[PDB]
Amino acid sequence: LVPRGSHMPPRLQRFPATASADEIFAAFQEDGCVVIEGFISPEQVARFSQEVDPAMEKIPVEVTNNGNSNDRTKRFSKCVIASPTFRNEIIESDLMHELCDRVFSKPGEGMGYHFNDNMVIEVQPGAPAQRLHRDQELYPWWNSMGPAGPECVINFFCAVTPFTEENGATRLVPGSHLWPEFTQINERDCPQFGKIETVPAIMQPGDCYLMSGKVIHGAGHNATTTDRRRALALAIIRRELRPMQAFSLSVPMKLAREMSERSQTMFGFRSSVQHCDVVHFWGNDGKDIAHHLGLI
Amino acid sequence: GLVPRGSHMPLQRFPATASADEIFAAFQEDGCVVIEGFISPEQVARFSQEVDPAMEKIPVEVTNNGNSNDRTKRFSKCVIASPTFRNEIIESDLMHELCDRVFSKPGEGMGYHFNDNMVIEVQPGAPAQRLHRDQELYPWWNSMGPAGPECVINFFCAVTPFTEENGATRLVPGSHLWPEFTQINERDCPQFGKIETVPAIMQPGDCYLMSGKVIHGAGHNATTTDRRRALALAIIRRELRPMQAFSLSVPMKLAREMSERSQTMFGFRSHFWGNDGKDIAHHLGLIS
Ligand SMILES: O=C(O)CCC(=O)C(=O)O
Ligand SMILES: O=C(O)CCC(=O)C(=O)O
Ligand SMILES: [Fe+3]
Ligand SMILES: [Fe+3]
């Protein structure tokens, strides 16, 4: 695309949502991130945006006097409550669960993952760029295991409205999941500070990128005047890690009863069973918590 | 003069009235430490009585299969079953004092919450448990070695007395400072078979605070009638998932009677475990 002799920026691989999960996972392993085009259908993504739009209108845009604050970005996590399309269809992506199993699920131990968050992230016009970071920084000890550590968290980060370089599409650093040392990206700790090359995740509505918690990234500057850049972050963690949202305590049981068993597991309405040499996480005295809740 | 001069020397003891800094210093040195009278004598007796009808309804497995349920009863509904547990035992200021030093960072509130409230009662004849570190439950933790942060700690309280014969836990002090944290088996542990233990001999109300990095295991209960009953207060970093879904099983009535700090321990109160920017205690009806 660029004239010969031009520097070539890093490559984000792209696959259709009809590609095999093995093909997409291979790219995720090589680079730490990969675009899945059509992850959500344009009709599903439009119904979702319409369904969460009243709640987004009620959230005020926060403007502050520190640019390093990551302001002018609306954030909304009650996707299940607000959106039938989200809870009936979006969280039922088999391709999403196929990839989560290839990341998180251990032999004969059931689902190895659950939801960390379901966040609509709408970056307002003029919002400053977000600091470069790894998402596993949320679990502060994880970087110390280096690239040899297991996965903490992954994110299916979906374009709800278009992602462009101008409106603040996430800037990603492919291959940063393989750097020898994982530090915070600051002047004191990161030798490459200020010299780190990123690439934007350009996406159409319904596209998503799957991104390892080991990948350096940061929301871009929204340099536009009118583009509210809407995203949906499906953040998925190991079953042994604590979620950012107490979904089982805020999502009503009426909606829990309508969930598939794997979706109840995702939100903590149903337990999981790990094997330690010769134990339930999130259980109830040896039983699945789903018994006590009436979920059978 | 603690062992005969010339002999090989083979676990410090403090009273609950001692300072948390003194108990924590020994905890840092050895990875475990006894706190005598951690729960008052009348409290542990009320507790034991209060959970005895729960324990009598637990059938005993006689399996010879080598897992931790072979002739060992385990029960986790201590808040539901015991007023003494939820009203007094969990409201120990020292427990929180020590939890703050293990887990909390300045300006960030409580850095810890409950993993489990488990009554463990080793039945007569139960084989000894496998040697393990409690942080094996979070399976990547050993890979960080002794430089890694603290994962889980356990206030392991004697409910009936612990003897060398009825199955008192065998501890390996200082195993939190070994250079490699491995599984403790013949295949993975070069020191297997030569690992030196000390038993945790305790009266009712005593406990030992143990680090999740310390190797240990329950002993064989070679007796005929002694059901060695224990109470394990497993506490984890706030970033880690509990083994019990306490905020879904403990009724809202009892949560309303908890202090703000106990609500946080059970997840009735929230960073992590929030509700779309707000404390989950708001939606639950727990903030004034
Ligand atoms: O909004 C974006 O594009 C990035 C958001 C993000 O990376 C985060 O919130 O951790
Ligand atoms: O019962 C004991 O003495 C030890 C039990 C224990 O360590 C466990 O179940 O994790
Ligand atoms: Fe991020
Ligand atoms: Fe143990």
Author numbering:
A (entry chain A): -2 to 275, 278 to 295
B (entry chain B): -3 to 6, 9 to 268, 279 to 296
Text of the article:
EDTA-treated PrhA crystallized well under anaerobic conditions, and we succeeded in solving four X-ray crystal structures of PrhA at 2.1–2.3 Å resolution in the apo-form, in complex with Fe(II) (PrhA-Fe), in complex with Fe(II) and αKG (PrhA-Fe/αKG), and in complex with Fe(II), αKG, and the substrate preaustinoid A1 (5) (PrhA-Fe/αKG/5). Here the metal cofactor, αKG and 5 were introduced into the apo crystal by soaking method. In the complex structures (PrhA-Fe/αKG and PrhA-Fe/αKG/5), αKG, the facial triad, and a water molecule form an octahedral structure with αKG chelating the iron in a bidentate manner and the water molecule bound trans to His130. In the active site, αKG interacts with Arg72, Gln127, Thr167, and Arg226 through salt bridge and hydrogen bonding network. The binding of αKG to the active site is a prerequisite to the binding of 5, which implies that this αKG-5 contact is required for substrate binding.
AusE (Mr 35,100 protein, 314 amino acids) and PrhA (Mr 35,121 protein, 314 amino acids) are very similar (~78% amino acid sequence identity) αKG oxygenases that both accept preaustinoid A1 (5) as a substrate to form divergent products through dynamic skeletal rearrangement. Non-heme iron and α-ketoglutarate (αKG; also called 2-oxoglutarate)-dependent dioxygenases are widely distributed in nature, and play a major role in diversifying the molecular scaffold. This superfamily of enzymes employs αKG as a co-substrate and Fe(II) as a cofactor to couple substrate oxidation to concomitant decarboxylation of αKG to form succinate and CO2. AusE first desaturates at C1–C2 to form preaustinoid A2 (6), followed by rearrangement leading to the formation of the spiro-lactone in preaustinoid A3 (7). In contrast, PrhA first desaturates at C5–C6 to form berkeleyone B, followed by rearrangement of the A/B-ring to form the cycloheptadiene moiety in berkeleydione.
